[PDB]
Amino acid sequence: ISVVIAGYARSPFHFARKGALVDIRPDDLAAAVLKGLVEKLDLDPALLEDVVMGCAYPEAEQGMNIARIASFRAGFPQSLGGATLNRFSGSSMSAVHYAAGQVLLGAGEAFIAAGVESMTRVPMGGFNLSPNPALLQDYPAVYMSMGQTAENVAERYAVSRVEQEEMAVRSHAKAVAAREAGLLREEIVAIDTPAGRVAEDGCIRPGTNLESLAQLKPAFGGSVTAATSSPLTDGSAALLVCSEDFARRHGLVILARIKAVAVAGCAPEIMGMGPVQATRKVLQRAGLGIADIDLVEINEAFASQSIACIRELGLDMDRINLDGGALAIGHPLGATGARITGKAAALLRRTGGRYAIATQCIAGGQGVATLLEAVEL
């Protein structure tokens, strides 16, 4: 069975606490994106087997199996399944991997693989934090801050502050170029809020420049700053993962075929390097080399780790994050894996490429990757 991505939708992404989505509960935000996806495809949600929702902190407003809450809030029929999946920042990419496996098993033909984070309304870390006392004593790197891991990569992989800032300039310039060309509009579901309808991304900072960035304070006692870190973000993203036969029968435009998937573990103290081994695994599984990949969506958790991974894999920077990356677009942890996988698929179709990879790092030392191919191949 050929497994494809045949739809991609997301909310605008906004800053936590200070942006336009602070009043929207994450279950309602996710439900709006689920509804917007099936409406853009003119697809009866009764045809869906299951909704798998990535969420890094699935508690409080993100609790009670937010996949199923969001499905009911979207008015989807009770016949669907729903399950919530936490692999921190990679959650909704693992939702794609889950769905792709069920398609291959013949355990249903059509799935939503989605994610959500309201970093406003469920702050990163959750409530009632309770680290394991034995690991905290014997293996403290398990609970290392993300910023310290970013400094560890900057030091050990030799990514200077100025190199990090150059990536922030390019991420924002590419995001602005894409936004101004209308190239972010089709993937967006506008969201209704008390202040009105939100249709545009909020984290992009046009005219980001080296001189302004050099004035910022270090965020973590070293090279990294707020500008070279993904911001705290609210957002949701959703993909239709289905058999190729299902997509063709319902007249859906196929963005890409899923050719290979992977997870890989790494040292937690340098968790930002997760993408290297996860990318090498999809390449090996696909029978491809890095030189075969037209474009990559590598999540910009921090410039230090994104650059370090790009260099280690031998990637051309001109093939990275074509319409901007998370330093500009934002990073609502549970939602990002669906966004970068869907965006990689939509970009592969838009550019007429053959292969794409979406990949990202994960707290606790992991990486995930997805290798996409043009469905014609």
Ligand X SMILES: CC(=O)SCCNC(=O)CCNC(=O)[C@H](O)C(C)(C)COP(=O)(O)OP(=O)(O)OC[C@H]1O[C@@H](n2cnc3c(N)ncnc32)[C@H](O)[C@@H]1OP(=O)(O)O
Question: Which residue has 């993937």 as its token pair?
Answer: 187
Q: Identify which of residues 222 and 364 has a Cβ nearer to its own copies in the complex.
A: 364
Q: Is 263 in the site for its own copies (CB under 8 A)?
A: yes
Least separation in angstroms between CB 349 and its own copies:
22
By a kind-dependent CB cut-off of 5 to 8 A, residue 146 interacts, out of ligand X, its own copies, none, with ligand X
- Name the helix (H) or strand (E) containing 35: helix 26-41
Q: Of 314-353, which residues contact ligand X (CB under 6 A)?
A: 331, 333
Kindly give the pairing relationship between strand 295-298 and strand 355-362: parallel
Q: Of 249-278, which residues contact ligand X (CB under 6 A)?
A: 271
Q: Is 96 in the site for its own copies (CB under 8 A)?
A: no
Q: Is 131 in the site for its own copies (CB under 8 A)?
A: yes
Classified as helix, coil or strand, 352 is coil
Answer whether 369's CB lies under 8 Å from 266's CB. Answer: no
Least separation in angstroms between CB 118 and ligand X:
14
Task: Check residue 226 and give left, alpha or beta (phi > 0: left; psi -120 to 50: alpha).
Answer: alpha
Interface residue with its own copies, options 11, 94, 164, 236 (CB under 8 A): 94
Quote the crossing angle between the two packed helices 91-104 and 333-351, to the nearest 10°.
Answer: 60
By CB atoms closer than 10 A (0-12, 13-18, 19+), residue 205 is middle
Q: Is 85 in the site for ligand X (CB under 6 A)?
A: no
Interface residue with its own copies, options 126, 147, 163, 200 (CB under 8 A): 126
Stretch that binds its own copies, among 63-71, 147-155, 214-222, 349-357 (CB under 8 A): 63-71
Number of residues that make up the chain: 377
Task: Check residue 188 and give left, alpha or beta (phi > 0: left; psi -120 to 50: alpha).
Answer: beta
* Count of residues near ligand X by CB under 6 A: 24
Q: Is 105 in the site for its own copies (CB under 8 A)?
A: yes
d(CA 179, CA 183): 6
Q: Is 135 in the site for its own copies (CB under 8 A)?
A: yes
Interface residue with its own copies, options 81, 123, 147, 222 (CB under 8 A): 81
Token reading at 79: 């016949």
Least separation in angstroms between CB 231 and ligand X:
5
Q: DSSP labels for 168-180? A: HHHHHHHHHHHHH
**List of residues contacting ligand X (CB under 6 A):** 89, 124, 146, 168, 172, 205, 208, 212-213, 216, 219, 226-227, 229-232, 271, 301, 331, 333, 361-363
